[PDB]
Ligand binder design. Sequence first.
Ligand code: HEC
Length: 103
Amino acid sequence: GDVAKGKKTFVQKCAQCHTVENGGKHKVGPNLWGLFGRKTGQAEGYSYTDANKSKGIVWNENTLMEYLENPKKYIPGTKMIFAGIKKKGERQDLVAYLKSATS
Ligand code: HEC
């Protein structure tokens, strides 16, 4: 159900870039393994200084709305090229997308 729609948006803006299976393997964004337990940083090879870290943090139910918001204002300076996602509809659904596919 509304996790269907996350992967739809997932093949539309998150799909072609991240991998997704067990360590899928990097290629632009590392594997996004299991959002649920980790702070920003340390995931199997990183790269980069402030951003992601800098701010330094936690992946949690929130903070992915936090990010999901728009990568401009928030760890503001992430090297991931993104436009937006600044809507309740698509932004809610994402946060379900990562809790059904990631774990
Ligand atoms: C669909 C909207 C995408 C979602 C959801 C995520 N990304 Fe990305 N993303 C990209 C990069 C390069 C990073 C790592 C590099 C850097 O910004 O410092 C990421 C990282 C994430 C993270 C990071 C998780 C962690 O800390 O380990 C999350 C939660 C995640 N992204 C969500 C780059 C790209 C990207 C390429 C163009 C696309 C289109 C997306 N990201 C899309 C999503």
